[PDB]
Amino acid sequence: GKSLIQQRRGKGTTTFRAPSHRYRGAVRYVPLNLVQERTLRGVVEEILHDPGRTAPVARVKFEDGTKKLIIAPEGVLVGQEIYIGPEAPIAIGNTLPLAKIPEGTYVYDIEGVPGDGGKYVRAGGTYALVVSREKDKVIVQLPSGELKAFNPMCRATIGVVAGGGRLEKPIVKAGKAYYIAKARNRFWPKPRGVKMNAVNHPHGGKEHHIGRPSTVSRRAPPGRKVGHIAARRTGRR
Template identity: 35%
Template sequence: MKEIPTPKHLKKKWPRSYGRNNKGRISAWHRGGGHSSLYRQIDLDRKDLQGIVICLEKDPNRFAFLARVFNPDTQNQAYIIAPKDLKKGDIIRSGKLKDLQIGHSRPLRHIPTASFLHNLSQAPGKKAQYLRAPGAFGHLVKKTYTQALIKLQSGEYKYFPLESIATVGIVGNQDWKLMSLGKAGKSRHLGRRPRVRGVAMNPVDHPHGGGEGKTSGGRPSVTPWGKPTKGQATVLKKRKRKI
Protein backbone atom coordinates (compact mmCIF):
# COMPACT_ATOMS: atom_id res chain seq x y z
CA MET A 1 0.00 0.00 0.00
CA LYS A 2 1.36 3.39 -0.97
CA GLU A 3 1.93 5.68 2.00
CA ILE A 4 -0.84 8.27 2.31
CA PRO A 5 0.23 11.65 3.75
CA THR A 6 -1.51 13.06 6.82
CA PRO A 7 -3.99 15.87 6.01
CA LYS A 8 -3.17 19.20 7.60
CA HIS A 9 -6.61 19.58 9.16
CA LEU A 10 -5.90 16.62 11.49
CA LYS A 11 -3.19 18.60 13.28
CA LYS A 12 -3.53 22.06 14.80
CA LYS A 13 -1.96 24.35 17.38
CA TRP A 14 -3.29 23.94 20.89
CA PRO A 15 -3.00 26.69 23.53
CA ARG A 16 -1.25 25.50 26.69
CA SER A 17 -2.17 26.59 30.20
CA TYR A 18 1.10 25.50 31.88
CA GLY A 19 -0.83 24.62 35.03
CA ARG A 20 -2.43 28.06 35.46
CA ASN A 21 -6.10 28.95 35.72
CA ASN A 22 -8.02 31.78 34.03
CA LYS A 23 -6.63 34.26 36.58
CA GLY A 24 -3.03 33.36 35.84
CA ARG A 25 -2.47 31.67 39.18
CA ILE A 26 -0.84 28.26 39.48
CA SER A 27 -3.43 25.54 40.04
CA ALA A 28 -1.27 22.55 38.99
CA TRP A 29 2.31 22.85 40.17
CA HIS A 30 5.52 21.73 38.44
CA ARG A 31 4.25 22.16 34.89
CA GLY A 32 5.69 24.29 32.12
CA GLY A 33 7.99 24.31 29.13
CA GLY A 34 8.00 21.14 27.09
CA HIS A 35 8.72 20.41 23.47
CA SER A 36 6.46 22.13 20.95
CA SER A 37 3.85 19.81 19.44
CA LEU A 38 0.64 19.90 17.43
CA TYR A 39 -2.63 18.55 18.74
CA ARG A 40 -4.10 15.57 16.87
CA GLN A 41 -7.80 15.85 16.04
CA ILE A 42 -9.17 12.54 17.34
CA ASP A 43 -12.58 11.25 16.30
CA LEU A 44 -14.22 10.68 19.69
CA ASP A 45 -17.77 10.49 18.31
CA ARG A 46 -17.30 7.29 16.27
CA LYS A 47 -20.76 7.62 14.73
CA ASP A 48 -20.18 6.83 11.05
CA LEU A 49 -16.44 6.16 10.93
CA GLN A 50 -15.44 3.35 8.57
CA GLY A 51 -12.18 2.57 6.85
CA ILE A 52 -8.84 0.78 6.91
CA VAL A 53 -6.06 1.30 9.44
CA ILE A 54 -3.12 2.59 7.41
CA CYS A 55 -0.68 3.20 10.28
CA LEU A 56 -0.23 3.41 14.05
CA GLU A 57 1.32 6.61 15.39
CA LYS A 58 2.66 7.93 18.67
CA ASP A 59 0.86 11.00 19.98
CA PRO A 60 3.11 13.59 21.69
CA ASN A 61 0.16 14.73 23.83
CA ARG A 62 -0.79 11.36 25.36
CA PHE A 63 0.72 7.95 26.10
CA ALA A 64 -1.96 5.99 24.23
CA PHE A 65 -1.19 5.20 20.58
CA LEU A 66 -3.28 6.55 17.71
CA ALA A 67 -4.46 4.75 14.60
CA ARG A 68 -4.96 6.64 11.33
CA VAL A 69 -8.02 5.36 9.46
CA PHE A 70 -8.51 5.89 5.72
CA ASN A 71 -11.91 5.63 4.04
CA PRO A 72 -11.41 4.68 0.35
CA ASP A 73 -14.97 5.74 -0.56
CA THR A 74 -14.81 9.31 0.71
CA GLN A 75 -10.98 9.63 0.64
CA ASN A 76 -11.15 11.02 4.20
CA GLN A 77 -8.84 10.23 7.10
CA ALA A 78 -9.36 10.29 10.86
CA TYR A 79 -7.47 9.54 14.06
CA ILE A 80 -8.82 7.11 16.65
CA ILE A 81 -7.39 5.84 19.95
CA ALA A 82 -5.71 2.56 19.04
CA PRO A 83 -6.93 -0.46 21.04
CA LYS A 84 -4.70 -3.36 21.97
CA ASP A 85 -3.89 -5.88 19.17
CA LEU A 86 -5.03 -3.47 16.42
CA LYS A 87 -2.80 -3.85 13.35
CA LYS A 88 -2.18 -2.10 10.07
CA GLY A 89 -4.71 -3.21 7.47
CA ASP A 90 -7.54 -3.94 9.94
CA ILE A 91 -11.06 -2.79 9.12
CA ILE A 92 -12.70 -0.20 11.39
CA ARG A 93 -16.49 0.10 11.43
CA SER A 94 -19.18 1.87 13.44
CA GLY A 95 -22.90 1.45 13.94
CA LYS A 96 -25.21 -1.54 14.24
CA LEU A 97 -23.06 -4.39 12.94
CA LYS A 98 -23.51 -8.15 12.95
CA ASP A 99 -19.87 -8.97 13.60
CA LEU A 100 -18.10 -7.45 16.60
CA GLN A 101 -14.32 -7.09 16.47
CA ILE A 102 -11.67 -5.08 18.28
CA GLY A 103 -11.90 -1.42 17.31
CA HIS A 104 -15.54 -1.56 16.23
CA SER A 105 -17.82 1.03 17.77
CA ARG A 106 -21.53 0.72 18.49
CA PRO A 107 -24.15 1.71 21.11
CA LEU A 108 -24.12 -0.17 24.41
CA ARG A 109 -27.48 -1.66 23.50
CA HIS A 110 -25.79 -3.77 20.80
CA ILE A 111 -22.67 -4.79 22.78
CA PRO A 112 -22.88 -8.20 24.53
CA THR A 113 -22.70 -8.40 28.31
CA ALA A 114 -19.26 -9.15 29.86
CA SER A 115 -17.46 -7.36 27.01
CA PHE A 116 -14.42 -5.15 27.53
CA LEU A 117 -14.81 -1.67 26.08
CA HIS A 118 -13.20 1.78 26.01
CA ASN A 119 -13.76 5.25 24.53
CA LEU A 120 -17.13 5.52 26.26
CA SER A 121 -19.47 8.51 25.92
CA GLN A 122 -21.40 9.73 28.93
CA ALA A 123 -24.64 10.38 27.05
CA PRO A 124 -26.00 9.93 23.50
CA GLY A 125 -24.60 12.52 21.11
CA LYS A 126 -21.65 13.41 23.35
CA LYS A 127 -18.00 12.75 22.63
CA ALA A 128 -16.22 9.99 24.51
CA GLN A 129 -15.00 11.06 27.95
CA TYR A 130 -14.39 7.77 29.78
CA LEU A 131 -11.73 5.05 29.41
CA ARG A 132 -9.29 6.78 27.07
CA ALA A 133 -6.01 6.40 29.01
CA PRO A 134 -3.43 3.75 27.99
CA GLY A 135 -4.45 0.31 29.26
CA ALA A 136 -7.91 1.53 30.30
CA PHE A 137 -11.00 -0.61 29.84
CA GLY A 138 -14.47 -1.01 31.27
CA HIS A 139 -16.44 -4.17 31.97
CA LEU A 140 -20.06 -4.33 30.85
CA VAL A 141 -21.70 -6.02 33.85
CA LYS A 142 -25.40 -6.01 32.99
CA LYS A 143 -28.10 -4.19 31.03
CA THR A 144 -31.60 -3.06 31.93
CA TYR A 145 -34.32 -1.70 29.67
CA THR A 146 -32.80 1.79 29.54
CA GLN A 147 -29.32 1.63 31.12
CA ALA A 148 -26.13 -0.40 31.19
CA LEU A 149 -24.01 -0.97 34.30
CA ILE A 150 -20.27 -0.67 33.67
CA LYS A 151 -17.39 -1.26 36.05
CA LEU A 152 -14.78 1.48 35.55
CA GLN A 153 -11.03 1.36 36.14
CA SER A 154 -11.41 2.93 39.59
CA GLY A 155 -13.64 0.06 40.71
CA GLU A 156 -16.72 2.25 40.63
CA TYR A 157 -19.93 0.93 39.09
CA LYS A 158 -21.72 3.50 36.96
CA TYR A 159 -24.89 3.45 34.86
CA PHE A 160 -24.82 4.73 31.27
CA PRO A 161 -27.68 5.10 28.76
CA LEU A 162 -27.99 2.22 26.30
CA GLU A 163 -27.58 4.66 23.40
CA SER A 164 -24.14 5.79 24.60
CA ILE A 165 -21.44 4.76 22.13
CA ALA A 166 -18.42 2.68 23.14
CA THR A 167 -15.58 0.91 21.35
CA VAL A 168 -14.78 -2.76 21.84
CA GLY A 169 -11.36 -3.65 23.25
CA ILE A 170 -8.70 -2.35 25.64
CA VAL A 171 -6.66 0.80 25.02
CA GLY A 172 -3.17 -0.11 23.84
CA ASN A 173 0.28 0.63 25.31
CA GLN A 174 -0.51 -0.96 28.67
CA ASP A 175 3.16 -0.97 29.70
CA TRP A 176 3.62 2.79 29.46
CA LYS A 177 4.39 3.02 33.20
CA LEU A 178 7.46 0.81 32.70
CA MET A 179 9.05 3.41 30.43
CA SER A 180 12.32 4.79 31.80
CA LEU A 181 12.95 8.44 31.00
CA GLY A 182 16.71 7.99 31.38
CA LYS A 183 17.57 11.63 32.01
CA ALA A 184 16.15 14.82 33.47
CA GLY A 185 15.94 16.45 30.06
CA LYS A 186 13.35 13.93 28.88
CA SER A 187 11.13 14.94 31.79
CA ARG A 188 11.49 18.60 30.79
CA HIS A 189 10.55 17.72 27.20
CA LEU A 190 7.28 16.30 28.55
CA GLY A 191 6.51 19.61 30.25
CA ARG A 192 7.37 18.53 33.81
CA ARG A 193 9.36 20.94 35.96
CA PRO A 194 11.58 19.93 38.91
CA ARG A 195 10.05 19.21 42.32
CA VAL A 196 12.06 20.51 45.27
CA ARG A 197 11.68 18.78 48.66
CA GLY A 198 10.39 20.87 51.53
CA VAL A 199 13.29 19.86 53.83
CA ALA A 200 15.73 21.31 51.29
CA MET A 201 14.11 24.78 51.48
CA ASN A 202 14.41 27.65 53.91
CA PRO A 203 11.86 28.16 56.71
CA VAL A 204 10.37 31.10 54.83
CA ASP A 205 9.51 28.85 51.88
CA HIS A 206 8.19 25.68 53.54
CA PRO A 207 7.19 24.46 57.04
CA HIS A 208 9.77 21.66 56.72
CA GLY A 209 12.59 24.02 55.83
CA GLY A 210 15.55 25.21 57.88
CA GLY A 211 17.45 23.50 60.68
CA GLU A 212 21.11 22.75 61.24
CA GLY A 213 22.35 20.05 58.88
CA LYS A 214 20.06 17.43 57.41
CA THR A 215 16.70 17.15 59.17
CA SER A 216 13.52 15.17 58.67
CA GLY A 217 11.33 18.27 58.90
CA GLY A 218 10.62 17.97 62.61
CA ARG A 219 6.87 17.49 62.18
CA PRO A 220 4.41 15.28 60.28
CA SER A 221 4.36 15.89 56.53
CA VAL A 222 2.42 18.98 55.52
CA THR A 223 1.90 21.04 52.39
CA PRO A 224 3.65 24.40 51.88
CA TRP A 225 0.52 25.94 53.46
CA GLY A 226 0.60 23.73 56.56
CA LYS A 227 -2.16 21.22 55.72
CA PRO A 228 -1.47 17.55 56.61
CA THR A 229 -0.59 15.31 53.67
CA LYS A 230 -0.73 11.91 55.38
CA GLY A 231 -3.45 10.35 57.50
CA GLN A 232 -5.93 13.20 57.54
CA ALA A 233 -8.56 13.49 54.82
CA THR A 234 -8.72 16.89 53.15
CA VAL A 235 -11.31 16.06 50.46
CA LEU A 236 -14.61 14.24 50.48
CA LYS A 237 -14.30 10.53 49.84
CA LYS A 238 -15.61 9.47 46.45
CA ARG A 239 -18.74 7.42 46.81
CA LYS A 240 -18.66 4.06 45.03
CA ARG A 241 -21.83 2.46 43.82
CA LYS A 242 -22.33 -0.98 45.33
CA ILE A 243 -24.41 -3.70 43.77
Protein backbone atom coordinates in the same frame (compact mmCIF):
# COMPACT_ATOMS: atom_id res chain seq x y z
CA GLY B 1 5.63 34.72 52.70
CA LYS B 2 6.58 33.25 49.35
CA SER B 3 4.72 31.01 46.95
CA LEU B 4 4.50 27.32 46.08
CA ILE B 5 4.85 25.45 42.80
CA GLN B 6 1.22 24.48 43.39
CA GLN B 7 0.45 28.18 43.24
CA ARG B 8 2.61 29.19 40.30
CA ARG B 9 1.26 26.41 38.08
CA GLY B 10 -2.16 28.04 38.17
CA LYS B 11 -1.06 31.06 36.13
CA GLY B 12 -0.02 29.40 32.88
CA THR B 13 3.61 30.12 32.14
CA THR B 14 6.06 28.33 29.89
CA THR B 15 7.56 26.76 33.00
CA PHE B 16 4.26 24.91 33.46
CA ARG B 17 2.28 24.84 30.20
CA ALA B 18 1.96 21.77 27.99
CA PRO B 19 3.85 21.83 24.66
CA SER B 20 0.83 20.73 22.65
CA HIS B 21 2.19 22.15 19.39
CA ARG B 22 4.43 19.07 19.50
CA TYR B 23 1.56 16.59 19.54
CA ARG B 24 -0.76 15.00 17.05
CA GLY B 25 -4.29 16.28 17.12
CA ALA B 26 -7.12 15.57 19.50
CA VAL B 27 -8.92 12.24 19.39
CA ARG B 28 -12.71 12.36 19.20
CA TYR B 29 -15.16 9.97 17.51
CA VAL B 30 -17.55 11.75 15.09
CA PRO B 31 -20.51 14.08 15.68
CA LEU B 32 -23.69 12.04 15.91
CA ASN B 33 -26.01 14.28 13.94
CA LEU B 34 -24.11 12.48 11.15
CA VAL B 35 -24.20 8.90 12.48
CA GLN B 36 -27.95 8.44 12.85
CA GLU B 37 -27.86 4.80 11.75
CA ARG B 38 -25.52 4.93 8.77
CA THR B 39 -22.74 2.72 10.18
CA LEU B 40 -19.75 4.30 8.49
CA ARG B 41 -17.03 2.08 7.04
CA GLY B 42 -13.37 3.04 6.99
CA VAL B 43 -9.86 1.76 6.41
CA VAL B 44 -6.79 2.02 8.61
CA GLU B 45 -3.76 3.41 6.78
CA GLU B 46 -1.09 4.26 9.39
CA ILE B 47 -0.12 3.61 13.01
CA LEU B 48 1.92 6.25 14.78
CA HIS B 49 3.52 7.43 18.00
CA ASP B 50 2.07 10.41 19.87
CA PRO B 51 4.14 12.26 22.52
CA GLY B 52 1.00 13.24 24.43
CA ARG B 53 -1.10 10.11 24.77
CA THR B 54 0.81 7.22 26.43
CA ALA B 55 -0.74 5.16 23.65
CA PRO B 56 -0.32 4.79 19.87
CA VAL B 57 -2.74 6.40 17.47
CA ALA B 58 -4.06 5.20 14.13
CA ARG B 59 -5.06 7.14 11.04
CA VAL B 60 -8.31 6.18 9.32
CA LYS B 61 -9.73 7.11 5.92
CA PHE B 62 -13.49 6.97 5.51
CA GLU B 63 -15.68 6.65 2.43
CA ASP B 64 -16.19 10.42 2.72
CA GLY B 65 -12.52 10.97 1.93
CA THR B 66 -12.26 12.37 5.45
CA LYS B 67 -9.34 11.38 7.66
CA LYS B 68 -9.46 10.86 11.41
CA LEU B 69 -7.30 9.76 14.31
CA ILE B 70 -8.43 6.96 16.62
CA ILE B 71 -6.73 5.32 19.55
CA ALA B 72 -5.30 2.05 18.39
CA PRO B 73 -6.57 -1.24 19.85
CA GLU B 74 -4.33 -4.19 20.53
CA GLY B 75 -3.92 -6.17 17.34
CA VAL B 76 -5.32 -3.87 14.67
CA LEU B 77 -3.54 -4.17 11.33
CA VAL B 78 -2.65 -1.57 8.73
CA GLY B 79 -5.24 -2.31 6.06
CA GLN B 80 -8.20 -3.38 8.21
CA GLU B 81 -11.74 -2.04 7.90
CA ILE B 82 -13.49 -0.71 11.00
CA TYR B 83 -17.17 0.12 11.38
CA ILE B 84 -18.71 2.89 13.47
CA GLY B 85 -22.43 2.76 14.20
CA PRO B 86 -25.31 0.91 15.83
CA GLU B 87 -25.57 -2.14 13.56
CA ALA B 88 -21.87 -2.82 13.08
CA PRO B 89 -20.39 -6.21 13.97
CA ILE B 90 -18.84 -6.95 17.35
CA ALA B 91 -15.08 -7.05 16.92
CA ILE B 92 -11.91 -5.15 17.73
CA GLY B 93 -11.87 -1.51 16.66
CA ASN B 94 -15.61 -1.14 16.15
CA THR B 95 -17.61 1.54 17.95
CA LEU B 96 -21.19 0.92 19.08
CA PRO B 97 -23.67 2.13 21.67
CA LEU B 98 -23.31 0.34 24.99
CA ALA B 99 -26.83 -1.08 24.82
CA LYS B 100 -25.84 -3.24 21.84
CA ILE B 101 -22.76 -4.56 23.71
CA PRO B 102 -23.06 -7.84 25.67
CA GLU B 103 -22.11 -8.47 29.27
CA GLY B 104 -18.54 -9.69 29.55
CA THR B 105 -17.05 -7.64 26.74
CA TYR B 106 -13.90 -5.57 27.13
CA VAL B 107 -14.38 -1.95 26.17
CA TYR B 108 -12.50 1.34 25.86
CA ASP B 109 -12.93 5.02 24.94
CA ILE B 110 -16.37 5.53 26.47
CA GLU B 111 -18.42 8.70 26.23
CA GLY B 112 -19.78 10.26 29.38
CA VAL B 113 -22.95 11.66 27.87
CA PRO B 114 -23.82 10.83 24.24
CA GLY B 115 -21.96 13.26 22.01
CA ASP B 116 -18.91 14.08 24.16
CA GLY B 117 -16.21 12.30 22.17
CA GLY B 118 -14.47 9.80 24.55
CA LYS B 119 -13.66 10.39 28.23
CA TYR B 120 -12.86 7.01 29.83
CA VAL B 121 -10.25 4.19 29.56
CA ARG B 122 -8.11 6.08 26.97
CA ALA B 123 -4.74 5.52 28.78
CA GLY B 124 -2.39 2.83 27.36
CA GLY B 125 -2.96 -0.80 28.49
CA THR B 126 -6.39 -0.16 30.08
CA TYR B 127 -9.84 -1.83 29.70
CA ALA B 128 -13.30 -1.86 31.21
CA LEU B 129 -15.82 -4.62 31.81
CA VAL B 130 -19.54 -4.58 31.07
CA VAL B 131 -21.59 -5.89 33.99
CA SER B 132 -25.28 -5.31 33.29
CA ARG B 133 -27.70 -3.87 30.76
CA GLU B 134 -30.91 -2.30 32.03
CA LYS B 135 -33.36 -0.21 30.00
CA ASP B 136 -32.26 3.04 31.66
CA LYS B 137 -28.59 2.47 32.51
CA VAL B 138 -25.58 0.24 31.86
CA ILE B 139 -23.14 -0.60 34.66
CA VAL B 140 -19.42 -0.69 33.89
CA GLN B 141 -16.34 -1.60 35.93
CA LEU B 142 -13.53 0.90 35.54
CA PRO B 143 -9.80 0.29 36.05
CA SER B 144 -10.02 1.74 39.56
CA GLY B 145 -12.84 -0.34 41.01
CA GLU B 146 -15.79 2.01 40.69
CA LEU B 147 -18.96 0.53 39.21
CA LYS B 148 -20.20 3.49 37.22
CA ALA B 149 -23.54 3.91 35.48
CA PHE B 150 -23.84 5.23 31.92
CA ASN B 151 -26.83 6.03 29.78
CA PRO B 152 -27.27 3.22 27.26
CA MET B 153 -26.92 5.52 24.24
CA CYS B 154 -23.29 6.29 25.08
CA ARG B 155 -20.63 4.98 22.74
CA ALA B 156 -17.69 2.71 23.37
CA THR B 157 -15.04 0.75 21.52
CA ILE B 158 -14.37 -2.96 21.80
CA GLY B 159 -11.03 -4.40 22.87
CA VAL B 160 -8.02 -3.16 24.80
CA VAL B 161 -5.75 -0.14 24.54
CA ALA B 162 -2.30 -0.84 23.16
CA GLY B 163 0.93 0.19 24.85
CA GLY B 164 0.62 -2.14 27.80
CA GLY B 165 3.37 -3.21 30.11
CA ARG B 166 5.16 0.12 30.17
CA LEU B 167 6.27 0.20 33.81
CA GLU B 168 8.02 -3.18 33.96
CA LYS B 169 11.45 -2.09 32.78
CA PRO B 170 13.01 0.43 35.18
CA ILE B 171 14.21 3.89 34.47
CA VAL B 172 17.84 3.32 35.30
CA LYS B 173 19.32 6.81 35.14
CA ALA B 174 18.42 10.46 35.66
CA GLY B 175 19.00 11.66 32.10
CA LYS B 176 16.33 9.33 30.78
CA ALA B 177 13.90 10.84 33.27
CA TYR B 178 15.06 14.27 32.13
CA TYR B 179 14.02 13.36 28.60
CA ILE B 180 10.74 11.70 29.62
CA ALA B 181 9.74 14.82 31.57
CA LYS B 182 10.98 17.23 28.93
CA ALA B 183 8.68 15.62 26.36
CA ARG B 184 5.75 16.89 28.42
CA ASN B 185 7.20 19.60 30.57
CA ARG B 186 6.62 18.22 34.03
CA PHE B 187 8.38 19.82 36.98
CA TRP B 188 11.57 17.83 37.30
CA PRO B 189 13.66 17.74 39.44
CA LYS B 190 11.67 18.16 42.64
CA PRO B 191 12.67 19.81 45.92
CA ARG B 192 11.59 18.95 49.45
CA GLY B 193 9.83 21.41 51.73
CA VAL B 194 11.51 19.82 54.72
CA LYS B 195 14.82 21.12 53.33
CA MET B 196 13.33 24.36 52.06
CA ASN B 197 13.04 27.49 54.20
CA ALA B 198 10.10 28.75 56.19
CA VAL B 199 9.08 31.48 53.75
CA ASN B 200 8.72 28.84 51.07
CA HIS B 201 6.71 26.09 52.74
CA PRO B 202 4.57 25.15 55.75
CA HIS B 203 7.36 22.82 56.70
CA GLY B 204 10.80 24.28 56.43
CA GLY B 205 13.40 25.26 58.95
CA LYS B 206 16.94 24.74 60.13
CA GLU B 207 15.93 21.31 61.39
CA HIS B 208 14.76 19.00 58.67
CA HIS B 209 11.60 17.71 60.27
CA ILE B 210 7.90 18.36 60.36
CA GLY B 211 6.60 19.71 63.63
CA ARG B 212 2.88 19.22 63.03
CA PRO B 213 0.75 16.38 61.70
CA SER B 214 1.03 15.81 57.97
CA THR B 215 -2.74 15.34 57.76
CA VAL B 216 -4.58 18.41 56.52
CA SER B 217 -8.25 19.28 56.37
CA ARG B 218 -10.25 19.53 53.16
CA ARG B 219 -11.13 23.02 54.43
CA ALA B 220 -7.59 24.33 54.78
CA PRO B 221 -6.91 27.39 52.62
CA PRO B 222 -4.60 27.39 49.60
CA GLY B 223 -0.97 27.75 50.52
CA ARG B 224 -1.36 25.15 53.26
CA LYS B 225 -2.60 21.92 51.59
CA VAL B 226 0.63 19.96 51.52
CA GLY B 227 1.02 16.34 52.55
CA HIS B 228 -1.90 14.04 53.18
CA ILE B 229 -5.13 15.80 52.28
CA ALA B 230 -8.21 14.53 54.10
CA ALA B 231 -6.55 11.21 54.80
CA ARG B 232 -8.90 8.55 56.09
CA ARG B 233 -5.88 6.60 57.28
CA THR B 234 -2.13 6.38 56.94
CA GLY B 235 0.55 3.74 57.25
CA ARG B 236 1.26 0.45 55.55
CA ARG B 237 -1.90 -1.67 55.57
